[PDB]
Design a binder for this molecule. Sequence first.
Ligand SMILES: [Zn+2]
Ligand SMILES: [Zn+2]
Lengths: 101, 95, 166, 179, 88, 53, 144, 116
Amino acid sequence: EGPDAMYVKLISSDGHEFIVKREHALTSGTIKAMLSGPGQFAENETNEVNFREIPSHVLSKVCMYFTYKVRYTNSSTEIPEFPIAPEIALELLMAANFLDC
Amino acid sequence: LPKMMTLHQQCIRVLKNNIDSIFEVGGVPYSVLEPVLERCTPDQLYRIEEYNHVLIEETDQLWKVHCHRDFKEERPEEYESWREMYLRLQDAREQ
Amino acid sequence: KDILCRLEHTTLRKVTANTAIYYDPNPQSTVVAEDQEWVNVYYISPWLLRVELDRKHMTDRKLTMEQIAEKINAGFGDDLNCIFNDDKLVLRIRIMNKMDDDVFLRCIESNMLTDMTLQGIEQISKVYMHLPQTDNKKKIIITEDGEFKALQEWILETDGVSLMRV
Amino acid sequence: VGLVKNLALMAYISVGSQPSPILEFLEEWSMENLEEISPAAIADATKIFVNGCWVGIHKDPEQLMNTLRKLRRQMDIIVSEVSMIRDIREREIRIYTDAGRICRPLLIVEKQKLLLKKRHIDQLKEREYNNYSWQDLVASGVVEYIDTLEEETVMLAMTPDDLQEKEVAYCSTYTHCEI
Amino acid sequence: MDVFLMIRRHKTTIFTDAKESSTVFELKRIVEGILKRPPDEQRLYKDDQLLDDGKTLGECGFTSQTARPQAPATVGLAFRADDTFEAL
Amino acid sequence: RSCLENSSRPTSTIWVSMLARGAIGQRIVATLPYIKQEVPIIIVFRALGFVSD
Amino acid sequence: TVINNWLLIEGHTIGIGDSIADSKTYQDIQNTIKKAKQDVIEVIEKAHNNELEPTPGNTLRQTFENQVNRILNDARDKTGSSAQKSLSEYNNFKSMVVSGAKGSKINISQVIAVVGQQNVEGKRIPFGFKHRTLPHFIKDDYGP
Amino acid sequence: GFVGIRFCQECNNMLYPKEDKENRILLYACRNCDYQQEADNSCIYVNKITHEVDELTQIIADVSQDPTLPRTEDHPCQKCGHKEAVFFQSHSARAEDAMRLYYVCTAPHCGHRWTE
Ligand SMILES: [Zn+2]
Ligand SMILES: [Zn+2]
């Protein structure tokens, strides 16, 4: 949330917003197109990412997956999977719309 | 599983194991839902389409993959989408 | 290995890839047309027996096509003429001079495949070379110092018995 | 030794049946007779043998075997002891109704799940109250008798633990389970 | 190795990354760096086991399992040490 | 070992065999019940009522 | 007479505790079995991807069988060696084996560690079904 | 290449090879009736002694429905991109010298068969 960008805040129209490592949110497709928008260099540092219509636990799983995938891609480990609950996958699949991954 | 998966692949492999868990899709477009519905069987497609009617006109080409697997000797006639042909021949064969 | 090749029976069947029968009444214009150049170099019944031999079997048996050709000539005594070349290992056999010659060439091709020996001894089907690691089948010698010394030397086994020829 | 054998406990030797219902059903389930076909149609079709009698050919053998298994599992036209074998590689369907075929009952597995549910077990716990018996379990399409020729085409799970198995189950196409 | 705790204050959750041994108020320092939180505003609660007054991460409540990228371990937060403990 | 169904009769056995290589080619013969010698199979097909090859 | 009357004082038994090994020994046996099964799978993958070189005097299937039987015999030998190495001086299987009275080290190995490969007519268990030993396996399964 | 049976038309019997020296060419003649026909291919008979290297043409696609066959998802189909395929060794008597795997795509309407 602070303009020194290693913590970025992101909101889903829910009370439970989430603030995450930008370096561990680096694998987002849309971090290159709505924080790295028409011009870089302090467009990113605003850290008001006001997404809509996502329940809190869903994007908690999504951004925990962000940290998960960033530190489990190009590391010494490549095997592990992601244990999502079966029902929430549906609404998590709409998160699959947003983040281009 | 010595494989890396992104969010699309993770969600669709979990859902590709438990198609049966789907009751109502909410508002997902078919273009997103295209993988899990192609690895599926026609009774489950009937269940999905009769809980999630808005998908019907999207899934008809999918029914072709079923039709040429269950009625491989057949072709549609004109004014016959593949879903209604599959249901008509399926009920005719059961009768 | 040279002795093993000289002992193991080698028919033409062990080294032949294929045999085909053709109607070629004019060797000046070969119908197969892949053998035109060397047949025209050489240049008769209109029936042709074209024998193609595998590369690997003709190599590891250490056989050259001249040996097969002279084996043909010794087997039949110029009852039939066999030309050959390679640079595909190609033989071409005709029968010079009421049992039409196609079934006679049938029969001599059966004789080719079964009843002809290239190298080795007829009753011996397979020869297994080995170097024994035990003293049961070694060459024990008495040295100049006077000990019994076991010498590991290559020994052969057979699957048939032709002891006197061996 | 080896020449005198004994039955396994659930082994049942088939008693014999008339091929006539299966033959009639095959005649009007799109199988064409041998008398009415040109030989050119035999190369791509599936030969159908009923008690070793080549009676015709079929163009869609997979749905035919699905239909025949559905008929036998609900104790329709095909009785339970009839053996039906699809030699898939050799394009043949052999139906045996004769006596002397030794078979055994196996639980039917569809999509890595037993068709035997807790409702069947609960009904069988009160066998002398519900009048639910083993024959009702056969008629339910839960168990079926597989002989030695059909067993050579089935895929047996040794236990239901082979069904409820994770990403590498060693087989995802189990058709039957040992009781 | 890693660490994974959802620093959960009802409607605000902080993310962290650290290793199996670090003083537990350095967590408050790394919250302070970007979220401008004085140590009064950083009364971290217990884990399922009681919290670490000895002030390291390799002490009670934290194991090698709680550094799970598959799913972390969460607990509530109160941004006041003695006065009030505000939830929602 | 052919035996007619729906009846209790002895089984009649037919042997459609092929001769060994050791003969210009190897031929298919038929050992029929109540026939002393082996019969070539094309003769059996012609006697069944199909003369053309 | 003298030894049979001293055996009244000493006594000799066999029990289920003579069939038990150490937990470390069980771990070693399971590790050896796992490694040998992995080796058999690797030889299977080499033969399946046409990377298996035939040995002189034998065809490809018989060289594969020789390699697999060598791996499994090494497994049975190593697990048996660990089984005898686990045995105490009070072990009665070991007592009857080193006395020469009854049994062998193979019997101790089969009781404690690994029964081993079953052979019919000198080869492994044949494909009595269509390319399957039993209908509980998949077709063309050449694993242990 | 192989040579097949060429049939007569008058009696539908077998045509046997023969030569005419007046035209000095090759003809397939029927010797039940008096039919004759000029022969297209000069090859009368061919051995295929070591031409058993191919087994793909004898495989049929129906083995994709075999539940006892091993299935893999690490060998995608080249013709259609389906992820799943059955694999099996050759079932011939020529398979004593090879444990080579053949693969058949399990997607319907494709039936593509390949090797390794
Ligand atoms: Zn004619
Ligand atoms: Zn395909």
